[model samples]
Target: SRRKWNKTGHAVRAIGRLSSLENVYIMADKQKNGIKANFKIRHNIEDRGVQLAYHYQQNTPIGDGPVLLPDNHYLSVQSKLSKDPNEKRDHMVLLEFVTAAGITLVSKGEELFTGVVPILVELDGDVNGHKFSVSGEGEGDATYGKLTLKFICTTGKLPVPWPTLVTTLVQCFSRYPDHMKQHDFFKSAMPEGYIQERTIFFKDDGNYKTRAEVKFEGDTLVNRIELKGIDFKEDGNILGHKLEYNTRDQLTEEQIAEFKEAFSLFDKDGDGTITTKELGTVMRSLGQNPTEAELQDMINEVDADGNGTIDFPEFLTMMARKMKDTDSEEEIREAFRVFDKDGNGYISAAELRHVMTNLGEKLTDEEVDEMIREADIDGDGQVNYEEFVQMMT
Candidate 1:
């Protein structure tokens, strides 16, 4: 025996449906945590990163926010079941928007079913003309279950420019200081105060550029920033270059990239790779050679058998580490050795070229002219092994 109850004074008679001869209980109660409330909570798909309940038995209310859908949006459901100890079941709440019911639980039985009720859900915002719907599916009288939901906003244009831009900036500028400064182009606009009183402007997007400004009050000044949406660029390469120039910390970016270029030279012992000797040479030239302690650091990085020396990969790692700190004497020795490969106490352009190509990139005729002016140690027209090593390394 059961009775149909309706709130909001809306009434309906159970006349035709009763003819189907079934056991359907419609119980109405005023209290919130009763069976009815739990039912209401489970099917209410909301936000808060929790998925629908499969074996959820406890009274947990779901949260409400954004839900992911299965359109231009894609969510990966991973149910890892393996010897890796990270096994899981697979479920997905592929909706345009969803909310959290804030409920979770496990059942001990062998079979059961859990899902949200299908109801008319008002999809909270004016989201790019997407139709909304709620759906759920699961079955088990089971032992274990966990729900994890992620909101993948289809219309949300998240800014991925910062990190990508930063990494690229570091890659390009870590070796060339003047170029970075020239490209990023930040100067003291206010002439007579701390650089903070000035402003540096950089491009953010094609259509928009951003400025890093310094604000002063009394005697102390601090960095302030504002981003404005500007016009997008039509040419892709220019846009990319602008993004990179501004993203990096100018000095640091040059240093890192320079270190990497130097490290590439040392993997030349032809075990098809680099050794510590090779790594040391390039790093020292880069001006931040590794220390004895840093040498030990290299050994730790590249020595696969825990040996005291480096293989190709280990050498690469040592260089990467040196890229972060100043070059130690050991690194200098390595660079010197390579430049002085014939060990004749001086490196010729032929020798320097080999080493330069390894530590730095190709030198054009003009750049080579400049390099010679700076590196020709003895006022001689050509640099000997000792002269070249001393100049660059």
Candidate 2:
């Protein structure tokens, strides 16, 4: 006579001998109204190699059923089981759902298994009576250690292959712009246009300046990019200027360094600071030809200590603040360069007209006159580098 099956709520406990096979699975209940699944580990090493399985037997030793995985079905089994010599919970079991047979499957990145492993394995409801589901934690080659399976039952369901879910997720994350823009930098610097190239520099915590360069794949989208550096600050605020420079292309590390070096040159005595006389001398050497009052004004702006002198740090702070503002002198020069075609010392009305036309906003002669009137600080009837940069930036 055949032996009768035992009616146990823990019917999943029967499945075992996992070490012999690459791995094992806890099958789902097929009945319209059947038992929920439970996972347990019984180490009878002498009898079976770490017997761990799902238990749900309502009325017989045969239990609910076993969903035999075909030879081709691959499971992604990854773990962070503690290897510490003095750690408890060191034998924790970790598992991952990868693919359900048919086509070959492989993990694309190492990051999927290195970080915190997620426990929620996504899946559609089972086939047959439309009951039972499965989820687990872990990714890698299937090895026998510990397996914790969660088998749930629902009223509605379908027989969806596990590969479908994995493929869908892979496709969802593979789109270039959508997936790449999810990163904070791309989200914040949502540049729209045929991007050419971008370079960034800023002081990190160690007082070392970090530099980064970004080149486009072709035109506007970021299907492929050549990124040269990494930054820790979320906003990527280099030079202490601001994030707006990223969008408008304002200050660069080289420009700021040049400004600092110029000031250091003015400090001929190497006292780490520059006096009003020194600043004036430098201005004169550069053909700036500043009046005494203009030199005094420049010194007042940068001399934070009110000691009738400017220090390197104070000058840097002033320049950084000016770069942060749209009307700063350095920024004005940057904008002026756009209109000063042929690298002329000043922006002629004809040059302004050319710029407006290129910008797709052809202005009348009167409008160009008005623009010069607004920006030409010295009433020179032409926009200088300082004027144009200040007005535009």
Candidate 3:
């Protein structure tokens, strides 16, 4: 037989605010045997945003399927059973909100299982004045959790509509789980440096488990995503979730130092990976010119596991292929200085392009382009000797 709730018909609620003015309100109520609920995001703004206040009074619990919400978003919840006997906690509460403006906000019941924290608090990692209380209690049999959002954007500064606000919340909220599931994305921030402060409180009726309220000043969706991904060390009534960093084979101290430099220079956005765009950005800053085609091609060649982005491990393999062990760092610079034709401390692509055109009669464009891509690396034209050497390596 399956575990039965000691107390049936317990209620769980998720309440949050986007900021001081952008109030995000939600109450998901469960009743009866616990297969039905209501989801609401009180939208006080005008226009298409008005429907945000519309209630989703469904007879079916979100665990059944996605319940369509205003602005094309769908709220969903499900319970998962741990197949892995070694799993830390039972997979009790699972949730998702499809960004039918079309996308995914999956709150996998992995890591943050059996805990109820509004999707917002997962993002606002340990800010200020954001919190709640917890009562030691239980409903060990219940796997279903209800979620509703309350969003109000009275801030005349950012005419942020409800969908936009909800999507942003989901986007940031989605990252914590996404990373746990081994997905990645680049870090970016909101324009003009403006940020939003948010807080969320969640409670389980039977367990009386009160989640923490965090004050998160997120500059962008990915901003909080990166922070949580990079430095997650919070454990309390709310963020009970623990992280398991994927470990790989060992590297020597020298190799570790080398990756630190290589990764920092190559991973321009600091997302802990080198993307095609990031590679191109680094190249352009280095005074080297490459077509977008060339950019994709290089990443294609270097991307292990065939993922578009070059994570740190893939980059170590890249580092191996690009540099010669026989040639020490200074020796590599000496080699670059040899290519710095005019001794300008940088290699100029324009110079390569000029000579390329001169030799174009017999040479094909692809060959010339490829040659220029290589020729464009090194120190005399733009990058400092170190970055130039990094490119060469």
Candidate 4:
């Protein structure tokens, strides 16, 4: 008899551990069907959106390279758990790194084990042109489990910038050593002194690559990234902004309160960030509806750090620009209503001329007629509510 297996390979904590990598932008989410693409990443500084990464299950296509990754080189992982019950929810994990010039390394499950086992499975294998192996363990056997996984290079080199590829197992492992301590699922309390709180990366020559530290200050996920290796201040980038420039000082007390309101309102599920659909809903409610393409542009622009899940600070910057500009629909409607004396929602040439002449600057009849013609999108001689907006804008 064995203890029940837990949902230890939750992707959130997996991506959480990978947050230690330098200049890395990582995120994950549950979609309509779940597992289409739960996780994604971009190396922001070096690649500037060049290299791409994703966690793909269901053996689905990676979609068009340009559309999904925006680059040719990517580290992809296919990981999912079988819920067929006949397999006792066996876990299947695979990691593959592909370069346009034909460097490939794959690590796949060595043996499948039911969740009831301590280490669900071991991934050790070679595929394509190179070899890779992984070893990891979990501490919970029910609901959510926390884990840490490490991959060993057995053949050709993994991409230098992609630390996630080397430790891609982090995508299935999560939580700090003591986040949950008890009888222990695998008969151990995480790894003794296992440093889940801070991760440091080193170059082949023993130089500092980059490092990140993550911890929860209560419900708040607090983390700091450092690039001490970089000598020039200009070369150092934090969240796509200069270090001194991205300060909370830019936000006042009330700004935090109100902006915090909208932030959580949009974030939904308290994930410390929001997604495309969540952002789209908030924008539509603000009376500023942009087309899907335009909305994606907005998301891509502010999601600058490559953390596809837009955080509060970045979102506030966008909100500040939007809140201050563009007249409200009501304000514009009110102004136009005054010009329509009959409240008929149409501005005639006569009304336009009268308002133009009496209201402030007197305009010639020809000028008023020209104004009407410019706004009369339907080819009508007069301007209706719809046309009024065009002219006003």
Candidate 5:
């Protein structure tokens, strides 16, 4: 007789009051039997009525089957079974409490129900033998559902980590089903910011519990854990993967100075600003040609005053935001002095040519002259100390 049965369905009976009942979502796994179920709680603002509609996987599925209620009301959930060989189902229900915009507020699943009788079975609203299928002297299926669950409600504010609890609860229900089933309710919840730092504790088996803390430092999310009051600080495990926080910080003063030195080398004219032409000339000297639009966009990003040129402060700001490292001012000056081979407070074309070739760049006389022309701020046909410093700093 038992071999001929192919029936399957699920029932739910929550055992606490749920107030401020915003929205409810029921999610079912993609079953191998082609059966799925989802539910929602919606309000008709125009009609001024609240609805709890169960969306079935059968009979040209409707979105939300209407059942009206008032604001801040709670309801029970369960499956109505009809015996048929064609019917197949699953009990893996993931109840998600969500906002109207589909953001999760909290989520729950079945507690421990191993090979024996289930521990946390529904017993709140049972009457005349059917679980949660009852009616009081005046209550009926019209006002609420035939099924019911004993739930608590409060008008005060919920915990800060309520949303994070929704996420971590879902995760724990899946991967650590046993642990979660053993500890169905949260013991503690704390939030630092939106998707930043969240910590939670779950109690189980009288005195046993587990703690999970997730933190976002810089750009990396670090998940640490404590099991049975012992710290588990390892990061190599799957549950505790680590990452390098790569978000860079602001530049130091020495680095900013070195960046200024580099910007000056490109300020061909001694006008305390780097023109678009000067930028182009430096690129030519480097044997790379940038498109006009590309160069303009770059200049626009750093050209704070809309003057069409980069001043020292603007250059420093740009470099501070972009450069990762730098050297001291003395180190930079010594390097400049080395490049100024003749020790005459300036670098001649001949001296620069020799240095460039020695560095294996091997630029022609024309290219060298072009570089000098770009850095010759005073149009003196050579690079002076001020011009060289502008080019260097």
Candidate 6:
């Protein structure tokens, strides 16, 4: 059975400051039976953000179903009888209820079952302006194993609330079984970034299984849906439950590298790069520019490369350059550290963004706008490493 406890802790942590911006608080492990669940909700119940939670419960001591002897369903009978006398039959189901104000209630139940038949049932309805339902089914007879049901509901608006098809597709993905395709948004929006595919499996004796997956295509949002499992006769709803990954906390080493590299690039003056004037100029070369005051400010702040002119690398460190207000040497050394995103002695664009944001001098809308007009030499929103260095020279 699924635990009443929450598990969204990882997800909440990943979003970091976004949680505060959205006025949402995620609470987990509040309650549990087996697996912990997480509650993502508004800090205030009255807040308009989505309020959601879900958990599972099992019915102990499964009962046997009535059957006849010398029946063609002997396999079904044998399966149930094979379980321990006290074993439980299992099934899982969920209930969803909502209010006009976007408050949602979802309940899931899991249990051991006697395999006379396996079924998956769902409920679809709406409460006030919100819509969703309760769903579940049974599998196995009182026996050696148990089944589980997961309940989940999301309130408020959809992610892409613009195009009607996109909105409907997202909603449709929710009701789909685990054996279905991965979420569709990944395919359309982030195809090259990541991939998600469906999975399937089969046994030699004519029994087959189809398990589903929500997979990533690459670094982008593109995804694949997979189904894997066994199939025997017709009416297939045989074994395993399902697996769902929101991809809320999947940070690849690549993304980390990207962020780190960006951070270092902007920390040209190296005082650990702060998004000030020098940092802005670095960002500008990489397709992000700072205000004139910011640029001049950094020039006055660092100027470490010594030819009476500051280079991009020097500008990066300037953001993190803490000074005695009179220690030029200290400022120069620190500036170097800022631009070397990985502290690897080389300056990369990604490293620049990281150190600058940390130094509390990230770019503003106005500055970004200026970059689009000035620094985008290739007409791209990004600057090549060579271009960046050239601009500084």
* lDDT per residue (tens digit) for residues 143-252 in model 5: 11222111111222211111111222211112112212222111011111111111222211011122334322342222332222122223311112221112234566
lDDT of each: 0.28, 0.33, 0.31, 0.34, 0.32, 0.26
Model 4: per-residue lDDT, tens digit, 1-393? 000000111111111222222112222112311112123333223321122233232211122111111111112221222122342222222322211110111011101111322332233332222234433333222222232222233333421322333332322222112212221111121121011211222211112222323222232222222222222122233212321111112446754555565466557678778777776665454333557665454455444344455677756654443322233355456656656867887888887665434323455666667666766789879878777655442
Q: What is the C-alpha lDDT profile of model 3 across 252-337, one tens digit per residue?
A: 67655555554665565678877777766544443456787766555544443446666787666444422211223444454454
What TM value does model 5 have? 0.25
Model 2 CA lDDT for position 43: 17
What is the TM-score of each predicted model, taking all chains together? 0.22, 0.23, 0.24, 0.25, 0.25, 0.19
The lDDT, on a scale of 0 to 1, for candidate 4 is 0.34
Per-residue alpha-carbon lDDT of candidate 6 for residues 1-393, written as tens digits (9 for 90 to 100): 000001111111111211112111111221221111121111111211111211111111111221111100000000010112352322112222110111111111111111322434333322122343333333322132232223222233321111111001101112211221121121122111221111212221112111112222231111111212123223211111111111112335654443334444444556553444544544444333457664443343233322333444543332122110111223233434434545554444455455445444456544434443443476655444434333321
For 92-136, candidate 2 gives per-residue lDDT tens digits of: 232222222112112222122222322223322322222333332
RMSD of 3: 24.6
Q: What's the distance in Å from true for residue 165, model 6?
A: 17
Candidate 2: 10-residue stretch with minimal lDDT: 1-10
lDDT of 3 at 115: 42
In angstroms, give how far residue 315 of model 6 lies from its true place.
17
Lowest-lDDT window of 10 residues in candidate 6?
71-80
2 or 5, which is superior by lDDT?
2
